């Protein structure tokens, strides 16, 4: 029955699921920008992937952590950077979910700030015994590329 | 009584309302950037409006879809663009609601990214039998214009 | 018992807490950009603080309001500005909470838009009888400074 105890519990769980998924996505940028490679990698399942058009795919937590520990990212941190992910649209289906959002990498160059990359992202998630975790993130530049538009599309 | 079943149901409904409204707003940019004109227009009620200072107002779903199908927007998509809407403040009052947020249109020009427009937005919504839908969106540039500040104000 | 009435009430309260805290943060930028100094200051407890590296700390609501009423901020509003705060990560612990987010100040200069400041923020909150309120906000530029990275870190 609508508004009975079992119904409220199901509806609350759905809100909790969505809020957990949004929290994962909102933690990415702070963790990246502070260099917390291990914790960032732990947003994903152990064999999670992070794919970017024109890059080698990072497969598994060690590889994802190695992106944050890597030269290029560390140099970006030394310049000054923000990995700014916007509000996500989220769809939950049982024990899986999908989100889409934009991301901008802001970079400080010569004492002024600019937009180093502007991208689309599509994320997938699954419910694990320890909570929701990312399964795959795909990212592409919104530079006219076809892939970026496809990542956003429903 | 606080925390009784009826009270929990009312409080849960309010959270659901706010999350639905935030989800509408978060879907706008992905739908715009992927060119999904029909679905974007369906964020609004049938006779919904989208007003921008110094532009003709788009009235009705066909007119709102025609903005995304239009030359100017399609050219922006070919350049590479992100319609980046920030987190919204939301106020629900019964079966209506209001939200305010910022939006930035990022555009790729000559292989680098910039901020093509930076704007205020005020959105109104109503509860329909099929869920929350937008009624009116108003937008103005944060270029010193009076209208943009008024859109944000409480 | 999981999913009993008392358990649902506790879980709902936690969602409400997080949504209230997110709403405080989402109101900051609209209030700043519209010049609503009083209401902006009332996001904080009476003796709340707003600290920015290399600035005098604003202590108390009058001082926080005086930032928005101040010359520098008013000139920024006349140029055209957006105080764009991204999605926050939020952790609630009882009657206190912490959030981290990015902020970008967009500014219109000579009819085009740019990123005037890009910053890290760490916010603390407490539950008051009138709802959640900010206690301290700290902000630093993501220009390579150590403080900005520390604000983001978990």
Q: Which domains does chain C have, with CATH numbers?
A: 1-154 (3.10.450.50)
For this experimental structure, what is the resolution in angstroms?
Answer: 1.2
CB B92 within 8 A of CB B126: no
CA-angle at C15, arms to C12 and C20, nearest 5°: 125
Rounded to whole angstroms, how far apart are CA atoms C83 and C40? 13
CA dist C102 and C107 (Å) reads 16
CA separation (Å) from B83 to B66, B87, C146?
17, 13, 31
- Residue pair A148/A142 in contact (Cβ under 8 Å)? The answer is yes
Q: Is A81 exposed, middle or buried (0-12, 13-18, 19+ CB in 10 A)?
A: buried
Burial profile C116-147: b = 16 or more Cβ within 10 angstroms, e = fewer: bbbbbbbbebebeeeebbbbbbbbbbbbebeb
Tell me which chain A residues have a C-beta less than 8 angstroms from the C-beta of C115. 106, 112-115
| Extended beta strands in chain A, E state | 44-52, 58-59, 81-85, 89-93, 96-109, 112-128, 131-141
Name the residue with tokens 């599509």. Answer: A122
- Give B118→chain A minimum CA distance, Å: 14
In angstroms, rounded to a whole number, what is the distance separating the alpha carbons of residues A126 and A138?
15
Mutate to test the interface with C, among A15, A113, A115, A118 (most CBs of C within 10 A): A113
Residue with tokens 């732990």: A42
Query: For A111, phi and psi rounded to 5 degrees?
Result: 75, 10
Cβ-based neighbour number of residue B51 at 10 Å = 16
Tokens 């956003």 label which residue? A152
Instruction: Determine contact, residues C29/B89, Cβ cutoff 8 Å.
Output: no
**Cα B122 to Cα B101: distance, rounded to the nearest angstrom:** 7
Nearest by CB: B143 against C6, C23, C108: C108
Tell me if C53 sits within 8 A of C141, measured CB to CB: yes
CA C71 distance to own-chain centroid? 21
* φ, ψ for residue B97, nearest 5 deg: -160, 160
Measure B66 CA to nearest chain C CA, in Å: 27
Residue of B141, B23, B33 lying closest to B84 (CA atoms): B33
B144–C80 C-beta distance less than 8 A? yes
Most C-contacting residue of B6, B7, B85, B87 (CB-CB within 10 A), to test interface: B87
Residue showing tokens 């429903």? A154
Q: Using the beta-carbon criterion (under 8 Å), do B88 and C26 form an inter-chain contact?
A: yes
Contacts for C139 with CB less than 8 Å, ≥ 6 apart = C50, C51, C52, C53, C103, C119, C120, C121, C151
Which of A3, A4, A102 is the closest to B84 by Cβ?
A102
Q: Hey, are the CB atoms on C108 and B15 less than 8 Å from each other?
A: no
DSSP, collapsed to helix, strand or coil, labels residue B52 as strand
Experimentally, the structure was elucidated by X-ray
Distance CA B145, CA B30 (A): 27
The pairing of beta strand C131-141 with beta strand C44-52: parallel
């Amino acid at each position: 029955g609508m508004d009975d105890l079992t119904n409220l519990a199901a509806r609350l769980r759905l809100l909790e699921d969505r809020e957990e998924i949004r929290e994962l996505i909102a933690r990415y940028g702070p963790l990246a920008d502070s260099g917390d490679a291990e914790a960032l990698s732990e947003l994903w399942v152990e064999d999670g992937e992070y794919a970017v058009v024109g890059f080698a795919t990072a497969k598994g937590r060690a590889a994802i952590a190695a992106l944050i520990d890597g030269q290029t990212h560390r140099a970006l941190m030394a310049d000054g950077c923000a990995h700014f992910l916007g509000p996500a649209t989220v769809t939950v289906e049982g024990d899986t979910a999908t989100a889409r959002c934009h991301s901008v990498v802001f970079r400080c160059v010569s004492g002024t700030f600019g937009s180093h990359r502007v991208s689309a992202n599509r994320w997938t998630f699954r419910r694990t015994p320890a909570g929701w975790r990312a399964v795959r993130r795909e990212n592409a530049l919104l530079d006219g590329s076809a892939a970026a538009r496809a990542l956003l599309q429903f």
